[PDB]
Design a protein around this ligand. Structure first.
Ligand SMILES: CC(=O)N[C@@H]1[C@@H](O)[C@H](O)[C@@H](CO)O[C@H]1O
Ligand SMILES: *[C@@H]1O[C@H](CO)[C@@H](O)[C@H](O)[C@H]1NC(C)=O
Lengths: 49, 49
């Protein structure tokens, strides 16, 4: 965190105080996909041919 | 106000597209934090007498 403050302030030394920094955010652990499972295909064959 | 969160929340493509806009939101972080820090300077000025 100290070196991240150094990165933010673009200075090799940081004075006493409190400094903002890029916020933290828990990343998505995995992925979820929810389609309505449906059998029939779309009649693109009838559309085209 | 977290700049990158407001404009380009949860998007890496958007985040890259904002760094090409220079450092506008650095000032926006600076200005509001400048406002927020002054708020303490307000209350301490009137009540911590
Ligand atoms: C999009 C589409 O339907 N394409 C059809 C293909 O499915 C079929 O195998 C071929 C021969 O009949 O003709 C064309
Ligand atoms: C999806 O599958 C579940 C069972 O796994 C079933 O109850 C549901 O009706 C299906 N959805 C559709 C849109 O048919």
């Amino acid at each position: 965190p100290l070196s991240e403050t150094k990165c933010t302030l673009k200075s090799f030394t940081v004075e006493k105080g409190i400094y903002q920094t890029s916020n933290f955010r828990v990343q998505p652990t995995e992925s979820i996909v929810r389609f309505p499972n449906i059998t029939n295909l779309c009649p693109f064959g009838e559309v085209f041919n | 106000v977290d700049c990158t969160m407001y404009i380009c929340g949860d998007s890496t493509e958007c985040s890259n597209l904002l760094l090409q806009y220079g450092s506008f939101c650095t000032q926006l972080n600076r200005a509001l934090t400048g406002i927020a820090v002054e708020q303490d300077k307000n209350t301490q000025e009137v009540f911590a007498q």
